[PDB]
């Protein structure tokens, strides 16, 4: 979902802006917050990508007979 | 057909092996607890945990055997080798897991009984190892649940 891609990118940008506003004083602290935000974005990206790759095309459907 | 010879044997074997393992573990734990109580009553009170682990293992084995027995419905289910085989496999797994857990619990109980006299922190830590062994036994029992559920394909 490209819409989900744009949403995740916007969320990352917002988080980066928040971290900058919070800790622009400490450039090293700002870099630390930026690295943390980047890592979190990468993790969420990988999770959603795996989830959607599962939904790309199903090999088989489920059976739930009583 | 030959299902009762398999299913009944598995149900009996699960309980037998689980009881044997739990009994050996409880005996080792009781010897250790007696030593600790001779050393100090507080250690005797603390040493109750291995007995609880042995009782939990025995209860799990009994529950698995009960589930296997309840699986036996010859009136509803036609005599299939697969239906008895699933119960036999579940019983064998439950019994082996119970025996292994009982032996490990006895060893851990003796160790923790020594540790309680050695140091309260040592006993507190060994409680975690006992819990881990109980969790392994529970995982075996859970696999037994899937084995029992596999019997559904037979009718």
């Amino acid at each position: 979902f490209l819409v989900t891609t744009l949403v995740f990118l916007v969320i990352g940008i917002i988080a980066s802006l928040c971290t900058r506003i919070c800790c622009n004083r400490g450039p090293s602290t700002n870099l630390l917050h930026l690295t943390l935000v980047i890592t979190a974005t990468v993790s969420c990206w990988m999770m959603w990508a795996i989830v959607y790759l599962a939904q790309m095309k199903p090999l088989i459907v489920p059976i739930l007979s009583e | 057909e030959t299902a009762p010879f398999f299913g009944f044997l598995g149900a009996a074997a699960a309980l037998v092996f689980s009881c044997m393992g739990a009994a050996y573990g409880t005996a080792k734990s009781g010897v250790g607890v007696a030593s600790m109580g001779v050393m100090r009553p507080e250690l005797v009170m603390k040493s109750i945990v291995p007995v609880v682990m042995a009782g939990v293992l025995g209860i799990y084995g009994l529950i698995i055997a009960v589930i296997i027995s309840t699986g036996i419905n010859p009136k509803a289910k036609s005599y299939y080798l697969f239906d008895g085989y699933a119960h036999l496999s579940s019983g064998l797994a439950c019994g082996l897991a119970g025996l292994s857990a009982g032996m490990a619990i006895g060893i851990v109980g003796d160790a923790g009984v020594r540790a309680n006299a050695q140091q309260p922190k040592l006993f507190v830590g060994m409680i975690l190892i006992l819990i881990f062994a109980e969790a392994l036994a529970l995982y075996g029992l859970i696999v037994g649940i899937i084995l029992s559920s596999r019997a559904g394909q037979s009718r």
């Binding site: 979902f1 795996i50 790759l53 095309k57 489920p62 059976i63 739930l64 | 529970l138 859970i142």
Partner: protein, 391 residues
């Protein structure tokens, strides 16, 4: 040397120090691990309900830390007081992990729609049919409950989870290689960095990346019968020829070329650095260490998949016990007793046993990733003359 650490950074510093120390100039990936270990643990396992409850308890502990500063902790409580912030971060990551898993409170829940996933067509046909179920609408925030949480959906879901864990391990190895390259830049070797880090990195990275790209291409093509074993079937023939299942039109010859390149790079990982040193004038440990590290990464991926499967099984067992208690209780008393027993058992299994096991496994995986990555131990902490009683 010892790096400055905040309250949240304290637990990461403690874990890193447990994993040895590094030189003052040597890069400390402890800060990166302070998110990576939560990132892996979230991928490793997580229960939405108890995990949220555990996070709330940790937050309450952090709030009451003022009293906890006065109130001396007992044994593991002391370590918990230090690592409360890290535990809270890990639980926060596990929240999104459970959201992906969709097992809210260790139970699937509908998202947005009345049912997140349903069966299109087959109104009279059973779920065990040729048509079976069609997911006309797919859950957008998590895995489709029909495709994952249903009775027969378990095998394909587990295979997909394992395949994703393989890619996650590949990514972790790539991150370790990047950290090694960064350290080499900090090391500032004129050509020795290119001779040592570049060949040691990249080789096994692309070796596993061939399979990762094969998995991606399979997800694009959507082969059904092989399930996640299409990659196993393809890699089953390291020899040339055949390659019918190859999605890429040139996948066979390109794969042979890549195998030849990896074979050529295998000595290039070891030989150049001692040759340069002799020209100026360990590798034996580095020998086979690449294969061992690849095996370890595969082991980490498999461990993550197994932990996720075990968590799902435990959640299913708890849900089954709760359903059995509720259904077979016309009177409120039996239902209440069963619910209380199930709640206690599930709490003990998940918040204590499963949580500790997952934390230990994640710590082991992060330690393996760091050891493969960098910092090579060999260091200690900075020594000031601080008043230990006062500070």
């Amino acid at each position: 040397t010892y790096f400055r650490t905040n309250k949240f950074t304290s637990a990461f510093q403690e874990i890193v120090d447990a994993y040895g120390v590094a030189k003052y100039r040597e890069a400390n990936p402890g800060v990166f691990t302070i998110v990576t270990f939560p990132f892996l643990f979230a991928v490793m396992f997580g229960d939405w309900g108890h995990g949220i409850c555990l996070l709330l308890g940790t937050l309450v502990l952090i709030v009451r830390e003022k009293k906890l500063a006065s109130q001396k902790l007992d044994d593991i409580t002391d370590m918990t007081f230090g690592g409360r912030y890290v535990i809270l971060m890990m639980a926060l990551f596990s929240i999104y992990t459970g959201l992906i898993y969709n097992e809210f409170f260790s139970v699937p829940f509908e998202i947005f729609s009345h049912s997140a996933y349903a069966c299109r067509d087959l109104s009279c046909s059973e779920a065990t049919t040729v048509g079976l179920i069609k997911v006309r609408d797919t859950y957008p925030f998590g895995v489709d409950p029909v495709w994952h949480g249903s009775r027969s959906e378990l095998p394909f879901l587990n295979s997909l989870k394992m395949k994703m864990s393989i890619l996650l391990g590949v990514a972790q190895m790539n991150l370790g290689i990047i950290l090694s390259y960064f350290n080499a830049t900090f090391f500032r070797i004129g050509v020795n960095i290119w001779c040592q880090f570049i060949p040691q990195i990249i080789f096994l990275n692309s070796l596993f990346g061939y399979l990762s790209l094969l998995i991606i291409l399979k997800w694009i093509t959507g082969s059904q019968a092989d399930l996640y074993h299409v990659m196993i079937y393809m890699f089953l023939s390291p020899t040339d020829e055949l390659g019918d299942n190859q999605l890429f039109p040139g996948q066979k010859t390109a794969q042979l070329v890549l195998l030849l390149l990896a074979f050529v790079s295998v000595p290039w990982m070891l030989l150049p650095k001692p040759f340069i040193l002799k020209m100026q004038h360990h590798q034996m440990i580095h020998t086979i260490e690449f294969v061992l590290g690849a095996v370890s990464n595969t082991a980490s991926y498999l461990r993550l998949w197994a932990l996720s499967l075990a968590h799902s099984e435990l959640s299913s067992v708890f849900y089954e016990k709760v359903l059995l208690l509720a259904w077979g209780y016309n009177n409120i008393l039996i239902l209440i007793v069963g619910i209380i027993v199930f709640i206690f058992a599930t709490v003990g299994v998940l918040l204590v046993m499963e949580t500790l096991s997952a934390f230990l496994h994640a710590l082991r995986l992060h330690w393996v990733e760091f050891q493969n990555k960098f910092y090579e131990g060999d260091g200690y902490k900075f020594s000031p003359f601080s008043f230990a009683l006062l500070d």
